Amino acid sequence: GVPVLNTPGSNQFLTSDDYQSPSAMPQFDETPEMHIPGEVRNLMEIAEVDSVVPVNNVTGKTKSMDAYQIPVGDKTKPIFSFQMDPGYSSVLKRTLLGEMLNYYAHWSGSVKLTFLFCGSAMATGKLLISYSPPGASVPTSRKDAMLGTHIVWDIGLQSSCVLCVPWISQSSAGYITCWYQTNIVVPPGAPTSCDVLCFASACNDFSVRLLRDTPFMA
Amino acid sequence: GVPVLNTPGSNQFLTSDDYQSPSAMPQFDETPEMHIPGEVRNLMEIAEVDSVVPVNNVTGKTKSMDAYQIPVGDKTKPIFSFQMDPGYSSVLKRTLLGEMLNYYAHWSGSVKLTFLFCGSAMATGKLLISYSPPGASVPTSRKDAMLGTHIVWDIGLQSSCVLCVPWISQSSAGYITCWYQTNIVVPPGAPTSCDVLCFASACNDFSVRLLRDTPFMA
Amino acid sequence: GVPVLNTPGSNQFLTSDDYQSPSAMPQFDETPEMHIPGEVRNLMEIAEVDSVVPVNNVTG
Amino acid sequence: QTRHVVNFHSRSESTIENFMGRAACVFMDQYKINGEETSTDRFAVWTINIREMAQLRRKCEMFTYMRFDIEMTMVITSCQMPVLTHQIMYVPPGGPIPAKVDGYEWQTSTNPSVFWTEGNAPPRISIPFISVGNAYSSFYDGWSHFTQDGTYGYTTLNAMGKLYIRHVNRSSPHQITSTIRVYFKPKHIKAWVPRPPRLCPYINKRDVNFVVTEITDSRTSITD
Amino acid sequence: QTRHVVNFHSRSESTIENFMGRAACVFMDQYKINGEETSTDRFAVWTINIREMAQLRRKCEMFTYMRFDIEMTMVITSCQMPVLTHQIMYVPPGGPIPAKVDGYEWQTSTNPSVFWTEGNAPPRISIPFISVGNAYSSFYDGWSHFTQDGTYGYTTLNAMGKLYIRHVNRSSPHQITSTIRVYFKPKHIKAWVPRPPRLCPYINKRDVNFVVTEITDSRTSITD
Amino acid sequence: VRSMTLGNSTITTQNVVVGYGEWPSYLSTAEDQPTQPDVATCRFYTLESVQWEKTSPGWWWKFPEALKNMGLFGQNMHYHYLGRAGYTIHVQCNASKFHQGCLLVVCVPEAEMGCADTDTTFPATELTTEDTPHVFTSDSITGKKVQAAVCNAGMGVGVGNLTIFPHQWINLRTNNSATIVIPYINSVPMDNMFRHYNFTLMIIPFAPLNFTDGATAYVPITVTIAPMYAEYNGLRLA
């Protein structure tokens, strides 16, 4: 019949191939597909969902829900500060963003952060959210944070300030520090100490290349 | 010649394949097909045929033809009662319906029942045929059967009442009980005790998926 | 199915062949090609470059 | 298990070709390679019929008449040397049979045979609709010999042939005991005249004789 | 390593078929060839489920509902003769299982099985979407038996079958111990209802029970 | 202020999070025919109000059977063994202006929860107490019951990234009301309403409640469920 000749690679089993498998049950006709709500067609649709970031993950507050709460209410040291990279960072590694990025080796994109102030409706103050570029050093003072990139976030007007941090990739990252511009001003009835929740997702669109096994599972 | 490469699955023998078998007798020309009456082109054409259902299959009446006869002619206990599922039910498992359904694991459809009254042409009475939904409990009295689904089947007018029981599938079923609404009224010449035959088939169309080996054969 | 017959030269490994190698990472999409200056498309573009010739290559 | 909403509408698995056309093992047999030059234990026979095992036999008795090509694939093993080559000779209904492993019938040009050597894919041999009539008859309410003689129920129309299997190797230093598993499969199958399913268990492979069995499993009362 | 300009724009590797559809070894098992005629160490079982190893199990728990064809390719070895032939019998969810290496279930025509002889390419058998429902459920917050009986969390919709594997050779002079590696692969996969990733380590392969684990790794202060 | 009414139940409300972008709908066969009640069933079933103190870790309800004693919807569960619904869920908080806090109101379809001491199961009355909610706990617990520690809500996931589901934040600084519409997520078109818990409404306080020594020591959380597009199996013959 047809003269064929087997190339190198015949009668082998490459694990990652896409050949036509001979079906064991050919007569069998499978169940018709109904419409089920909430289809996922791409993994990066999970990374685009905001989720609470455990910024206050200090040594004794990680098995409770005090990990998610940033205590607000000393103006010389910042409120919080963390590396801005969803991989290899204790704060952003178990986020929905940071967990769908540990399945991959090459990823690059931007990341948006939402700071929801969960204090009273009468508490009023200012917080200064500074961003350092990936090469720069952290601000040691509030003035040195003001001279860089910042957003003086008035709490009494808006209760949710949104960032969008670019240049986030791996294959020495940024910083999101936060400072007391003013103290929390509060009437006699409302409580003095408040909390700030944080969030993280993919800002506009996220690029991600090389799939691998996750490190968390043992 | 043509560079080919054998995939995984070459030189194997999958039992369920549909490959072109090399014919051993190629010169041989087979006998022309005449028209023989009564062709079957689908198994569910056997399930649509009515056949007598052994409702009276009590411990000593299964090797005779008293299994098929429901004795008619105490108004407090029902005449007969059985699970409405052609699989795993002693009454409906050896019917033409219930026997072409034991070749399959997934089946779903409806089932119609015909009650042929085989009494005299002068005997007259009423029977109340109640249906319980697959979750409901059986009626313990005639009134509680009347408050559900029923058909007061006048024997003196029509001698054959047809049901169509839906929601019949497996992958806790219904009930067809029957009650004395009235006794069998009979003139002095005709006999007092009568019989009722039952039938079963597929009502409109029947769905059936996964072929298996039958349990009956050993 | 299709009646084939293997010729001489089947199931051998000729070192200089140009067959379609089955890719190990099919899902993987490689990095886009940027324009890098100074592409070589032929070796004889190196021979056409002048270079200094050691004529006075005496023993010392 | 639980009762689920089995919602779909399909009867493609209930057609005749999707019901009968399934490969099932119908013949295991042993056959040696050497010793006992005049012996019957050096080859296999298996007269081809549908009444082999009761699971398949039951399905062919749903229908009175049926016609179908058969496409069997043998699966041959060996125990205990060289590389072994086998021979699976299908003789038609009109065909000479061997009496010994070294008979001359094995060389008959009208008996098609496959020569499968060990290690390759299993040998597949396909046989068309041989019968003289227009269909194979599962049941034959009649007598082979005219005027109501012996042999009830056996017609010669539903004769399919035989399948003689041997080693082609003439001898061996030690004993090799090969095992063959014939996988019968109906193909391009049509079926006429449906028929009620078998109720009683099977007694013998050439008759319809039975013991009177109860209709269904019994229960206590008519109302429970 | 150093932080480079990772400049490209692609999410083709983040789709569901390019995330789940990867072959992973899910079942190693030994099975002998001879001795102990009534023994359970002459065949393999592996009830097919996604909760086999925690690396794959974690990926299937990203999503609540998913449906997919499976295409497994076995990789069979041997130790210690003739050329060996194996049998990988997939039984459906509704299917009889063997109790011994010589049971009659192995000859069931409705259980598809491949007969792979040693030396060739690995055997590949593909199984469609079997389930009764419209998708396989990774999680089932419900009870199998009505009225809150035992067996929490186990539905019968996400039953995929079993995979019985044996030698077809009846015996051998010496002992041969074969090893099989089943390579499971989802194919043509769809997935619904995303779900947060697993945080705690896995305890058992049939439940969701866990030990309370910390959210993230701890650091010294909130500002370092 | 919008005063919604359904049947003989009127509530007073003050944006809707449509779960998975779909509004519940009916299933659209003579072999199996559904019955659409429409009458009643759709009215508002206000559960008992839940007091939220400074030390409350959370709550959860398991539906559809949280409504198993709620009127005609809880009575049609006993007569039909198959059904489906949509469950518009309003969650008010009616705190004051000096109270502070934040809630996660999330629905979590198919919340298979884990036992407190593994190697065993729980007696099935630990997942649900019909109307009343099972609270979470602040730390780990033992015994044959649900591991109800927050940070690992029920399923062994992080409680912070529980936002992937249909959710709504109730920040007492800004808002007080939440509303979620959950269009019957299941792998089979109809399922039994006593075996299977289709979703798990769990309300989890991320930022804890705080106030001074003059305010009320709690904030009552009011839960209201309206079963929409509920349809059942047929009981009549064909």
Numbering used by the authors:
A (entry chain C), B (entry chain F): 3001 to 3073, 3078 to 3175, 3187 to 3233
C (entry chain O): 3001 to 3060
D (entry chain D), E (entry chain A): 1043 to 1122, 1132 to 1275
F (entry chain B): 2013 to 2026, 2030 to 2043, 2048 to 2257
The authors write:
Viruses from the family Picornaviridae form non-enveloped icosahedral virions that are about 30 nm in diameter. The capsid proteins VP1, VP2, VP3, and VP4 originating from a single polyprotein form a protomer, the basic building block of the icosahedral capsid. The entire capsid consists of 60 such protomers, arranged in 12 pentamer units. Here we show that the exit of the RNA from the particles of echoviruses 18 and 30 requires capsid opening and results in a loss of up to three adjacent capsid protein pentamers.
Specifically, we performed cryo-EM of echovirus 18 virions exposed to pH 6.0 for 10 min, mimicking the acidic environment that the virus encounters in endosomes. Asymmetric reconstruction combined with 3D classification identified subpopulations of echovirus 18 particles that lacked up to three pentamers of capsid protein protomers. We call the particles lacking one or several pentamers open particles. The missing pentamers always formed a single compact opening through the capsid. Reconstructions of the open particles missing one, two, or three pentamers with imposed five-fold, two-fold, and three-fold symmetries, respectively, were determined to resolutions of 3.8, 4.1, and 3.7 Å, which allowed their molecular structures to be built. Except for the missing pentamers, the open particles are similar in structure to that of the activated echovirus 18 particle: increased diameter relative to the native virus, reduced inter-pentamer contacts, absence of VP4 subunits, and holes along icosahedral two-fold symmetry axes. The capsid proteins next to the missing pentamers are more mobile than the rest of the capsid, as indicated by the three times higher temperature factors than the remainder of the capsid. Residues 1–42 from the N termini of VP1 subunits, which were previously shown to interact with membranes and facilitate enterovirus genome delivery into the cytoplasm, are not resolved in the electron density map, indicating that their structures differ among particles. The N-termini of some of the VP1 subunits could reach out of the capsid through the openings formed by the missing pentamers. The openings formed by the removal of one or more pentamers are sufficiently large to allow release of the viral RNA, even if the genome contains double-stranded RNA segments.
